[model samples]
Target chain A: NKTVVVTTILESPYVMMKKNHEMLEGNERYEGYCVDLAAEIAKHCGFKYKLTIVGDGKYGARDADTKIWNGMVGELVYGKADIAIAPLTITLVREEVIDFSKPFMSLGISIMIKKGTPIESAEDLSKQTEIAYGTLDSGSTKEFFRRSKIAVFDKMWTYMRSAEPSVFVRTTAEGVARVRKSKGKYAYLLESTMNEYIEQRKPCDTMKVGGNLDSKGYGIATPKGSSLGNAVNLAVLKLSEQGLLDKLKNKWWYDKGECG
Target chain B: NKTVVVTTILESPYVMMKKNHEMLEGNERYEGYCVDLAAEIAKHCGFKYKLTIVGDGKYGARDADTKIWNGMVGELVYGKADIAIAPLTITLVREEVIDFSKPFMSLGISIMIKKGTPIESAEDLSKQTEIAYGTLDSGSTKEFFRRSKIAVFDKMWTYMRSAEPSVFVRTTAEGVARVRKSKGKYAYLLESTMNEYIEQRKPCDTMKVGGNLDSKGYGIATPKGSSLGNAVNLAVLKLSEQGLLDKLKNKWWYDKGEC
Candidate 1:
């Protein structure tokens, strides 16, 4: 005598308030790729679910000083929702507290350069002094290069660490600006999702070059339990195989592109 | 109390006989990608294992009329081995009777065209007849077209059914010959692994075009289980994350390219 509950966050193209939200109710009040995926998932898993957005209006993060969880991830820890079906990223600490289905899509560190920069890949960037590059300081992107033993990345990291100008930018916005201001002289190391999202907006002076440097994934999240995720996990694989996920992505992400 | 037994098949790059096999014992007698994977797998799973080859020298197939399994698949079906570590493909019928780990890698149908043919993607090929495209006859490649609901592939299937000279080739060899003999006029639809393997060989006249049309994967094979797969499956994921699988691929598949 219980129904499923899905906790989601309203991120553009992932989950968005419906255009006619004032007139709609329940799950129909919102729509996006996650909404469509949730519908498909429940259908395959044979359950009815109530779709609810997060209360805090934040994605998910833990506070370092107090060791307190907040946002969509916090909802799972507090049992505020049965499942988190948003674009919640899969990370190691989160995995210890909650469970996750296999990643629905993979993501990774990306190289961002202004259009017509002539950089094709990370290896090419490493081999050149003409185009200087750097990463977002105090972030995983910085740590990845610092710890990498791969010859190409190691050499690039050493150069950035010792460059005349501190290549590391304090924020992603600052990093993005540096690329444009420097023209073809500098490139920014960043995350692919953000790299792609920025490129799709107006005055698109930026572009992602090469495949991701390393890989991570976005997963369907849930509180750790006895057996809740099995059917949901299987449902995800089925939807992916039938190309429904990719179809939904084009509908929400590209077909409605602000630029192009 | 039983030690694990790994049953594998001989396929270039995946598994192959070592040059000094006659002078070796146990797992040392053979080497390839699967051999290296098994070695690493045991290291993480904390177990010792014996390595053996498929005695029948066949990949795997169930005889149609007899309803019996053979080759590496048969070894698992009848409990002759604990696992299959070769390039055994993941298929539905096999999964019904056995279990498999999450794929270590993905693969799909690919485009094979003569170099400089000016075709870039399946969509491009679907829009033109300047270069005729067809798939191998009587295989999964043929079935994919026959069943596809996508507009581009559906149109291609329609053309293939109505073509005057029969673009469908009986064998892969026949298909490769058609691509070359017909020059720039034909492209062959085939599997990516086969497409890339052919491209790496001497002459290298044919080249793969575009990304794979659809996706599938190659998984480690196991007989059905309850938590037995937990550790082995995690090991595959860990190894993949560290990029060991890709590194192993470059070692066996590319470094020693026959060409």
Candidate 2:
């Protein structure tokens, strides 16, 4: 059977539904960052793909406790997706199981502290015992803090994961909301680009602080030993060298916001 | 004790004694390729030195048959000489014991054949059964052939090591004369820069043939722990970036050979 490529994901601004969530078929409802990126990838790679929701609603990796599939990575490893165009981070451990293209963008873990929060940098947060901080469950930012080597983040993980508020959120929206209502008491760690996007929204009530703690880059990941890895990598390099990657970042985060 | 650096070598035209065997000192006697290189290294490094011969009268490396210390690397490694500035090829094995400056010049192994030689490339010689081919012993060209993965060279090594009628010459001059006189039957492997320089000289009946099989570069080497290594590497890089390397190569090898 001739196949349209599959790009798997979990939720919105990537693959959420339109106002009329029930009626859309293919192109009628697709919107957000992943949708825009997939358009560019298809144009360059000469392939068309369908946006498929991940079978399980979790970010994929070894669950250790459940030992079951979750998120887009598991879908690709189990042969459900051909390529992943999500803002998936490339890690050395993950690299052993999957091939990642050259980095298309660089970002880091940043904190969304409420306006006038006592915390300015992760270094300041590491020292104070009064204010609390945390991250979304199983997100890339949490994973970075969990495995960081530097002094500030080593202390941050120790403080956040075991705090009185039990500092982990189920989703990014919940993490941002926690900071918004708590005044100067709580801050949440998430991807810098995503945090910057949220800061420009209606409330404009929070701000990102201290820059990213660790160096990470987004890549187009494929199954280990897949032939598509090289072609996608070369395409990304071509786009990056031409400055299209930077253009996309601005378009998705700044120029075009979903307005009422 | 204040150390005096001595630069000496096994290569000819630089350290070889004049036919008269008389001692000549300073820049007057300090002519030729190695001498000029030594002068540049000294002038840049700000070192005081007295030019002296290696005590054993051999290049500073282990001689396979004699199993003794020789070659310029030996001079610096053992502190017999504080520094040895010459056409020493930098290699990983050598780098472990001594740190090398970034290469001041780039070259590769090229074959020199007499003007009328039948061999035009290494493959041309590989196809022939009558001609003898070999590279100089105890030099980078020989090491390159021994380690090369190229099919033609892998097949030619046995013939090169022990070719009857002695295809290998101990010196460049001898190899050039043999190729000039042997009427295309003999070929010598040496650096491309040296080959190009010699081809422009009188009795210039020899020419370089075949693209270089392996690339190498010359560097100023100091003992691995020496403080001078970083400064020297940056110094060479600065000069090379300024096009001074090409200027020096043309000055010392071509226009000023008579000096």
Candidate 3:
């Protein structure tokens, strides 16, 4: 009856409630890239796990002065969860606080704009005052802008900070909804993996424009020095080397494209 | 004497009150990069000009709601000034209303950090939440961020727009003062040329860290289709070719390095 507790968020195509989840019990109620990857890792590492949703649906960021952590990262830090199986980014700051498995997928920040929106590049967006844009709140993308030293990104941070009416959103779903509803007034900055997956879904009103802003990867996370860390890391490397990661991506993303 | 009204701002090492101004009159009362460049362009183009300080002391940005140009650009667009010869950038929107001489100098947005600060690159500043930063208000750098579409920058814009107590400064001097007074807690983003020039001045507690944010050039501006446009353009090109621009820069910026 030894069950590893798995913590994740309800981001689509990653960890989500199954359509019939109301009638289903336990892990059967959820499915996603992370769900499948978690199962694969468990099978490869030979362990039993209970998939649990993170109580607060946040990726994680540290409070600068207070030194407190929030979201899935906090769960792992406080030993509330055994592992984080979600679209958690493997960032340098995160690595300092907890251990991450080898990245199972690579992604970078990307722009989600409505079709025919005039924006073409960061430079284009940075030079005009017409269309307003923003990124998700308290996630890797938010931290990326917060921590970047590149002049363009730094200048952008300056604008976003002082813009009237507050452009930031609480979740990717909220950001995407803003993009769809803003009539081209708003652009959502998020990970390319989720941007691509959502672009292939319903309404089909949005598209991933331009190349990714920066390159990083998504990895499974464990508390620092956890015994499962090295095993999960190797399991990810093995799955990637055997092309199983590719197969899973094809399964959750392209094969399930809901929009024509 | 047909005095061509030249509009400029009071930005340091560009346009400023001359130390011996009480003894001097007219154009002779001013001294700096744009001042000397104006003298050179006038001598080459064969015209007398009066160096007039812009009344509003703004770098120039069009108010989104009013659609009225402000600062030096406003002076030119309203026929209040015949020409603008400060650190006026050649932006596309500005070009529609005003003509520019070939750029006399190049610059990009750069970080100005007080000496001993731990920040190095934009990445370093972006990653940490402890240190606060800002940009010069109503300038090309401000406009650059307002319009950037790059993911990192767009994300940054979101943060800046909502930062408490306002992270923007009214002038480059205000931004510099904030950094100097903040005890390594504040950084200012401004043009690299100005950043480099200021880093060499007295106090010398600030340093320009990392490369520029983007590449652009400073040009002398004239009212759209003004008679002085072609002549000023040729004067700048000639000065650049004759190495006079280089000499003037050396005389004003590097040779007078106080730090």
Cα lDDT tens digits for candidate 3, B107-175 = 778899999999988777777778888887788877777776555556656667777878899988899
lDDT of 2 at B136: 65
Off by over 4 Å in 2: A10-16, A19-21, A65-69, A257-260, B1-259
Residue-wise C-alpha lDDT for candidate 2, range A1-260, written one tens digit per residue = 33445565644345556677578787556676667667777777777677776666555555769765457677777777888877776654455466666556666678888888878888888899777889877556776677666678888988877887588887778888899998688888888877887776667788888866654566788887876775676576556434466567667667755331
Q: Against the true two-chain complex, what DockQ does each candidate achieve?
A: 0.21, 0.02, 0.01
RMSD of every prediction: 5.4, 20.8, 24.8
The pairs that clash in candidate 2 are: B59-B70, B59-B71, B60-B70, B60-B71, B60-B72, B61-B70, B61-B71, B117-B184
True contacts kept of 1: 0.00
Q: Pick the candidate with the highest TM-score.
A: 1
Expressed as tens digits, the lDDT of each residue in B106-208 for candidate 1 is 5678999998999999998988977888876645567668767788888889998888788887656678888887878999998787687668766778899
Off by over 4 Å in 3: B1-259
**Top candidate when judged by DockQ against the true structure:** 1
Off by over 4 Å in 1: A9-12, A18-26, A52-80, A87-103, A114-147, A151-194, A215-217, A223-226, B19-23, B52-78, B88-99, B114-147, B154-188, B256-259
DockQ of 2: 0.02
User: What is the Cα-based lDDT of residue A98 in candidate 1?
Assistant: 74
